[PDB]
Amino acid sequence: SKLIFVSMITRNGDRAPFANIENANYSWGTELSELTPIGMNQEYNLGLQLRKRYIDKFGLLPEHYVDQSIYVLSSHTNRTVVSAQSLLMGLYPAGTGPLIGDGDPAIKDRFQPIPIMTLSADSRLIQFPYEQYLAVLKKYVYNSPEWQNKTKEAAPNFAKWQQILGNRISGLNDVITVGDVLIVAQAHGKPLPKGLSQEDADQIIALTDWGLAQQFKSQKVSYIMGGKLTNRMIEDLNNAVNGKSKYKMTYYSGHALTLLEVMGTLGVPLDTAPGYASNLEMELYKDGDIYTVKLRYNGKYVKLPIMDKNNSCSLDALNKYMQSINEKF
Amino acid sequence: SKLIFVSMITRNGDRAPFANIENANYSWGTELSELTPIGMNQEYNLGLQLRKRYIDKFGLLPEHYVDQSIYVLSSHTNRTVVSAQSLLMGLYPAGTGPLIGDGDPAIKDRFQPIPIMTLSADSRLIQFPYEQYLAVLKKYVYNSPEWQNKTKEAAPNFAKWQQILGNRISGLNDVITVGDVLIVAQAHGKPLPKGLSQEDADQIIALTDWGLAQQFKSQKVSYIMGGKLTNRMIEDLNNAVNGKSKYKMTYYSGHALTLLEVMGTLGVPLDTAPGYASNLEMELYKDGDIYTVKLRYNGKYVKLPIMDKNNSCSLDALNKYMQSINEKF
């Protein structure tokens, strides 16, 4: 059985936060929401790793980029485009790019350009529009028993946290909001805000991780946001078999929620929120007329309910599995 | 007076053709419509030249890329994205990209990622949808006196050209179709199709050049297709003065028609079809409260009807001029 196609999602690399903690004066060196040099490096290294896997080990992809062999589609954000570019700088690194004339590089250092398309900003495929996302949470998540129970447990800390950080804190949603800033601060080795102990920072960060993952423990929520992309990825697999497409890989450059909503849709929701440059791959294998699929997340295979002891299932079985999810929602 | 903002359009670099000449067996080394290594090189060199101009000479832009300083928007084609990427590898070359840790490169060779967004495929901003374009030609161009006169002149050659090339040739539109293939062949040093003399190839290519430019000698045609982008570029200039934007440059990665339609809209239509990596810049200058604009095309300033002996006009004058064009169409 040989690997014949992969569909992949990444979360972007390390970025600045989206907003500030009111009572801290952090300086990021990068504009809000933008990918940092650290984030470029993370994606670049993921690219190098993917080269070792999909080029060197499996030989699915060649050492020099073949035009139209990879379809790359990004959400409409700078960080996801730059993340995909950085990753592709690892997958097809300097030295492998095209030559002109008598073996002279088309671009200095033999860089390899690989096209990246972006969705429109209003597309719901990779990044669910924020207001619609929050509306989904308000309706399906915030009043769920699990969210209410966790709110009750965390609630006695809200007043203290609000007074320390300055930002409004009146529910788990607000905890997640400031939690992302603290995650970025920690990732950049910044000191704690004055009066926020490490213990408290740890609690806020833990609640943030818990909250993000909890949202997608609901398959219904996951499907609303991720059903479209999950269907599309499986259709990509089908297209590598039915002759509709000649791509060796489709790559969707996305966000933490993109990974969460797909894993959640497939009925294997993540226990923890995806870190920077987290990634999932649907791998399609061929042995004559037998097609098999495996699902890899952050370097480890994942067993869907329909999979055998070897974390594998037929592509037919995956189609039937997805079909039933579609019918369910 | 100091340069404070530039808006730029490029045509993509050298590409394979869109279709084949039936009676030739050309091999391109690249898929149809895709940018070639030569095209990557052309755009990369254009980038280097733009660095010498807008970074070294004018000092508008810094030597190291500032996030959110340049807005790059491409049509939804591989060649325009890859052309923009290649250009940006010249504008902000290896060695200038970000560092992490203790002066260690974020990406090997200090590559600089710069985000590129794409329009949707159905957007009319940069690339007018092909069928709609042809509809515009059929209605406004093909029956114009100039088109009919040239048709009558060229018509005695159609039978011969069709029999030699194989492709249908029954009007100037068909000449332009095969003419692009001959342009690509010549650019790649391919031999002529059997039975097509150099004289005949020269005639077909000259008609192709003439035809493409002729379309935009009509300001009405130019405005239908290019009014939106022309207005947008001037609005970019306004945004650099009114405080609405902090970009130093907006860059629209487009096609021959993109250049043709904007130049045509401005009432300065091109005499000849834009070659690969042709480019235009709207330059905005500031001396206190006085704002002046210049228009550069392929390395030379262009005098709009409203400009003085020095190829310059006030931004106020440019707005009024565009306002009247809008009112006219």
Ligand code: PRO
């Ligand atoms: O997660 C956030 O807070 C930002 C807001 C729009 C989507 N990303």
Ligand code: PRO
């Ligand atoms: O010019 C051409 O022929 C191709 C067809 C769609 C637009 N570009």
